[PDB]
Amino acid sequence: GPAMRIISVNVNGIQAAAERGLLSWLQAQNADVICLQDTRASAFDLDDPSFQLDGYFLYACDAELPEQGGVALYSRLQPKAVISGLGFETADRYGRYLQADFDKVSIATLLLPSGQSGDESLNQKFKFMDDFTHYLSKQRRKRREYIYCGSLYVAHQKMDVKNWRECQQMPGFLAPERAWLDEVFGNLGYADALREVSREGDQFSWWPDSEQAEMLNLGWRFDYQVLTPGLRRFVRNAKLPRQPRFSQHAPLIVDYDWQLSI
Amino acid sequence: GPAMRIISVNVNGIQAAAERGLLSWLQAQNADVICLQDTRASAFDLDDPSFQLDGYFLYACDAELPEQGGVALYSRLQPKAVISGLGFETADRYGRYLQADFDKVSIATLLLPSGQSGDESLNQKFKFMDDFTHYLSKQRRKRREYIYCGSLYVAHQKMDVKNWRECQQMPGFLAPERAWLDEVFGNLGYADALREVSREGDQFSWWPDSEQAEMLNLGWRFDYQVLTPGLRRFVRNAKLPRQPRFSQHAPLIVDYDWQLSI
Amino acid sequence: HSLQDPYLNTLRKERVPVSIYLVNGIKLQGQIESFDQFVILLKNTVSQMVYKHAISTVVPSRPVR
Amino acid sequence: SLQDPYLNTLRKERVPVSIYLVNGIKLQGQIESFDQFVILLKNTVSQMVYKHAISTVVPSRPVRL
Amino acid sequence: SLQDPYLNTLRKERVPVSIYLVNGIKLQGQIESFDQFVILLKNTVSQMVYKHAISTVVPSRPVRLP
Amino acid sequence: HSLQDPYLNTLRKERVPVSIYLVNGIKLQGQIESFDQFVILLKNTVSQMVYKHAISTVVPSRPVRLP
Amino acid sequence: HSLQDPYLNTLRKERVPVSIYLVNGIKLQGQIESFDQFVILLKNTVSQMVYKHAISTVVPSRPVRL
Amino acid sequence: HSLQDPYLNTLRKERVPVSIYLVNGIKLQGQIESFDQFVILLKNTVSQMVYKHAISTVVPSRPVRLP
Amino acid sequence: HSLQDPYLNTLRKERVPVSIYLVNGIKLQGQIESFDQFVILLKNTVSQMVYKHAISTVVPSRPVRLP
Amino acid sequence: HSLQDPYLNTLRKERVPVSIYLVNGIKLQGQIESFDQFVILLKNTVSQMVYKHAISTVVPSRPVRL
Amino acid sequence: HSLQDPYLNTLRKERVPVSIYLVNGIKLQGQIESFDQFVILLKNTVSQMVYKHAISTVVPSRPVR
Amino acid sequence: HSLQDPYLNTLRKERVPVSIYLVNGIKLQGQIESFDQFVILLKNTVSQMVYKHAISTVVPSRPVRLP
Amino acid sequence: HSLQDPYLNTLRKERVPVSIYLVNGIKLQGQIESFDQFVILLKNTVSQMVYKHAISTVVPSRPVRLP
Amino acid sequence: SLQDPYLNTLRKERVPVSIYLVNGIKLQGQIESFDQFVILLKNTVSQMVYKHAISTVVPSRPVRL
RNA sequence: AAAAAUAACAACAAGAGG
RNA sequence: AAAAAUAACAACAAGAGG
């Protein structure tokens, strides 16, 4: 039947990931839409032919200061529209959102501040979370399906973290942070594309740069593909490849039964 | 691809509709689940071989007084479960609800009091509407998709009843009644299987017994198949044939792009 | 045994459609075919056995006895 | 023992009680009879609750032995 | 008792059954053996399931015990 | 049943505001009128009757010693 | 009874700080001071009594010999 | 006990890594050191005494069988 | 319209990415290629013409000033 | 009308499949067969007459440049 | 002007049933009996005068011209 | 103007009650008492002034003739 | 402007509180300072300018005559 | 006329006005420019608002002519 | 980034964005 | 009518029904 592959890898800089083999890897995956979060580059830097994958259209939303954000998107088919930004400041001038509008579905890509540097990052993280909650409250009236390929930097449940009793205070597993995912996935009806097929544990996606954590698999699951509820049943195969990763994050490869059209 | 067809018809008595040829019609439609509202017969009356369609399993929920309600269901595949009633007595002792639990979907069939006889039926109708709203508020936490084949006896929109300015005061187009469908389809996110595909006017499911209403097409839409939101996109086509008829109501026929399993 | 056995047998031979609740809140519904000291098997569409240590409550739909 | 005099005292003069199950489901009604294993409570229907799934039994009116 | 003959009829006929535990988790397989206390089933590997933690044992095919 | 009846009897003689936790995490304060092989009574505005197979833990709010 | 009774006793007399897991997932932690057939007396700031039918596992902090 | 004890003995002697699923869904993976008729002891980094009445399933990683 | 076209011409020659709100609430985010007295062509991925009687407002993404 | 008329003549003479979005949001797919100062003749099955004062946008399916 | 006036006259003379879709999506089906600039008279059981600046589309039911 | 003004004059001097429809769907009812090039005066219990650029249709209650 | 501006001047001289319904279907109450062929001023607590192409209807709160 | 001196007095005083569009969308900010067909408003970025989509223009403070 | 279209809400002091 | 399974909420006065 029809199929649609989406990869939502977070790169922590597209230059430092492209030196490690990102673009030679993404070509051999046969994805329809690739969503790149935290690209750490301006719009002129992605205009070079070093990043232009053949067969894919590249669209990017950069930050004003390009080290603080940036979001990229490769697409097999040309979209009906490309919309940058959400409408508020922390999403707009930091370049943490891009949207590719297609025929019936529209595939979005979303970056969040980690909140792991300082308290001002956690404060603008809570600002972004409240404003994006107000955005999701408004977007449920429309007649279009969304795929938010987000790097939320927030883990949902005890299954998504290793040794949750020691991880209660670090940013990424906070109680107002996990209550936000209990609000988005629970009451707002939105689905997780990884939880609809595999409820297996020990499927982590983020690891710190210390080798002792990755050799003992002390991981995190930060990046999601949040689905509008009409998409719940279209999910076939959602996996997180642990070994061929190119950053602190892991790619998220989700195969759907949808047929992507213009 | 995969297909499923669901036919829901309010028969106004299965004996008086079977004398009009209903069972000879339903055999030549290749439906998977046929849902019959206000069947007006006990459980012993549907145990006779006069109503047993070949190839279909018949399950019925009768009232204690068989003239006041009754619900029937024919199924191609045998369900995992058959559940009669939904918890409150105005459908329990009046027999206005049956459910066929299949593999990943449950197809339900629902009858309502019309509120067209007197004011006590209208108060019973408001009681049923509030209790079924409390039921739909509780059923939002489950992972099972529902299709409710509902003889709702309410017309949702100005498109759904012929001349709406003269219809404002009749039971079937009341403002607390249409506000209930505005709350079910709008804020609880449920679909209408007709309006997911066709939004042209002059589709109606019920007419008065007067022939002037028949020939001018002074009809109303009182029949729906109401879908949990994950089913919004599993709707190929939906139709309301005027011509073959067995009741004050036309059949509602819907085709789904979905594959019914045990 | 002085109450459980004349109750399940009365629901069995009269074939009252009963609703059996489990200890995890799952509501099953059907007719009781027979019962041991330890099990009750019910038929809705498919006959299935349910151990009595998982049964919280047996509720008939219509009044019995 | 304690259970056999207390439930007899509770059923002979018919206190409307609330039985809390092990999962948190509460049940209003009055006890009619009880064996070694089950309790038959009845508000509007003859209901049978297994005692291995009962957390607490709370009377609404104060009772003494 | 029908505790033992029903499980013997599911075992000897090799009926693929579904066992629902006391927390809703189902296990599909084929009952290889059983004593008073355990039930061993094999879908992929052999597996011992305790009888105090199951809730329902349903067969895929309609089987009435002799 | 070798050591648990001196513990509950020590709670019964000198009456302690005992907190009993249920198997589903429900906390219940009160005072023990008496206990049985299978069941324990509790004193409050209403007098609770709680079976032992649903009781997870029994703790006193006051540190009591066991002779 | 032939193997849990030496294990609880060698958790008792060496006063190993144990973590005891209830069947609903509640992690209690303290010291084992006494145990009959039916309960285990967990010693902490308050000395509480834990029924054995509500206990999933009893883990030690340090690995001990048996 | 006539059929679970040679099964758990086979799980001991061939030293296969087992996984015990509890009655609340929690997987405890390790290998069985010794079992009573009331408890099982599993070793991964410390020796756990898991009670037999809190266990739903005991499933090994590789397929083995008793003679 | 002596003041309407130092503005659209500045957004055309500097190629500022703009956002055009229509009178029915539809937001079209794009980039002006050319303009008449009556229409404006924008280029997001494909060039489209937009009639000015349907346009409610035109905002730029970054602040700009007139010659 | 320096770009009003040549763009529509280029869409007309090349007879491209075009999509007109009206002022209320209605999407009309067809082909421009003729156009005056006031009207545009879309056509797919039975042709149309579409007034320009209710047209919001006109989107060609293929890339069209003057 | 030069193209809507030969079109509405062709709709008027052969008397084809037209459908006039207004700005707000509301359609009016009937026949065109007469027209000049700024109005179109739609004929039905009663005849109505529709202003031409409140019309989105005018589509006939039969392919003509 | 060659056919609009005799129609409104015929609806005026025969005093036919009209149901006049606005462009947002609002049905007003009254009867036509006066009209210029730009507005129409709809007489009822209050004398309004409806604007012709807000009017979609003008519907008489009874079928009337045109000269 | 043969018949509109006498009606509006009749509304202006007598200082009658009028209600202007816009094309959005919303109402605005108050008197009228002045007008032209494009806008109308309104006296609530705020002094508004209302464009005449967005005005649907103009009604008085009580009937005024027009000579 | 009347629009030009009103908008000139409202521009030179720099009143933080509110413009309500025909669909009900409220815009905040003072007025930089206007010619015949369009108005440039400003609070943070220079917004170009067409006059045929404006319903009302409301000053925040009382304005004299 | 838009319901091939609500035979029509005597009328939402106004959804910084339908 | 039931998440092939939350290496585990020092603990929901208690979802007439998880």
Author numbering:
A (entry chain B), B (entry chain A): -2 to 259
C (entry chain K), K (entry chain C): 5 to 69
D (entry chain J), N (entry chain F): 6 to 70
E (entry chain L): 6 to 71
F (entry chain I), H (entry chain M), I (entry chain H), L (entry chain D), M (entry chain E): 5 to 71
G (entry chain N), J (entry chain G): 5 to 70
Task: Show the paper's wording.
As a member of the extensive Lsm/Sm protein family, Hfq shares an ancient structural core that oligomerizes to form toroidal architectures exposing several RNA-binding surfaces. The Crc protein is a member of the EEP family (Exonuclease/Endonuclease/Phosphatase), but the absence of key catalytic residues in the active site cleft indicate that Crc has lost enzymatic function. Crc and Hfq act together to translationally repress mRNA target genes. To gain insight into how P. aeruginosa Hfq cooperates with Crc in translational repression of amiE, we determined the structure of the complex they form on the Hfq binding motif of the CCR-controlled amiE mRNA using cryo-electron microscopy (cryoEM).
In the core complex (with 2:2:2 stoichiometric composition of Hfq:Crc:RNA), two Hfq hexamers sandwich the RNA and Crc, with each Hfq interacting with one amiE6ARN RNA and two Crc components. The assembly has C2 symmetry, with the molecular twofold axis passing through the interface of the two Crc molecules. The Crc´s in the assembly self-interact in the same way as observed in the crystal structure of the isolated Crc dimer, where the interface is generated through crystallographic symmetry. As anticipated from mutational analyses, the dominating protein/RNA interaction is made by the distal face of Hfq, forming an interface area of roughly 2270 Å2. The two Crc molecules interact with RNA residues exposed on the surface of Hfq, and both Crc molecules contact the Hfq-rim on the distal side. The Crc protomers form contacts mainly with the backbone phosphate groups and exposed ribose rings of the RNA. The dimer interface of the Crc pair is the largest protein-protein interface in the 2:2:2-complex and has a buried area of 766 Å2, which typically corresponds to a moderate intermolecular affinity. The key dimerization interface is maintained by salt bridges between Arg229-Arg230 of one Crc monomer and Glu142 of the second Crc monomer, which is further stabilised by pi-stacking of the Phe231-Phe231 rings across the twofold axis. The 2:2:2 complex is therefore likely to be the minimal complex formed when all components are present and must be constructed in an ‘all or nothing’ manner, somewhat like a binary switch. The structural data indicate that the dimerization of Crc provides the key step for formation of the 2:2:2 complex, because it will pre-organise a copy of the surface that interacts with a binary Hfq/RNA complex so that a second Hfq/RNA complex can be recruited.
